[PDB]
C-alpha cells in the first residue's frame, strides 16, 4: 500500500468479506481479518494498525 487510505480500502473490503458485525469491536474485526488468508495483504504494511486510525 502506497498510502494509509489504500490500507483502509482493503480493511473495509475484508470486513465485508468476513461479514464483520456492526457491533463488533475494532480488535475483534482485526481478529476476523487475521483469519482471512488475505491478511498478509495488510500484514505487509508495517503501519497496518496505524493506517486504521479511521476505524480505531
Swiss-Prot record:
It is found in: Nucleus speckle; Nucleus matrix. Residues 4-56 form the FF domain. Expressed in the brain cortex (at protein level). Widely expressed. The WW domains are essential for localization to nuclear speckles. Belongs to the PRPF40 family. Binds to WASL/N-WASP and suppresses its translocation from the nucleus to the cytoplasm, thereby inhibiting its cytoplasmic function. Plays a role in the regulation of cell morphology and cytoskeletal organization. Required in the control of cell shape and migration. May play a role in cytokinesis. May be involved in pre-mRNA splicing. Interacts with the N-terminus of HTT. Interacts with the phosphorylated C-terminal domain of POLR2A. Interacts with AKAP8L, SF1, SRPK1, ENAH, ATBF1 and MECP2. Interacts through the WW domains with formin proline-rich regions and with WASL/N-WASP. This is Pre-mRNA-processing factor 40 homolog A. It comes from Homo sapiens. The lineage of its organism: Eukaryota, Metazoa, Chordata, Craniata, Vertebrata. The chain holds residues 390 to 445 of 957 of the full protein.
Amino acid at each position: 500500500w502506497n498510502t494509509k487510505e489504500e490500507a483502509k480500502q482493503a480493511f473495509k473490503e475484508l470486513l465485508k468479506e468476513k461479514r464483520v458485525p456492526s457491533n463488533a469491536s475494532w480488535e475483534q474485526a482485526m481478529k476476523m481479518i487475521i483469519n482471512d488468508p488475505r491478511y498478509s495483504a495488510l500484514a505487509k504494511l508495517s503501519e497496518k494498525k496505524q493506517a486504521f486510525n479511521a476505524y480505531k
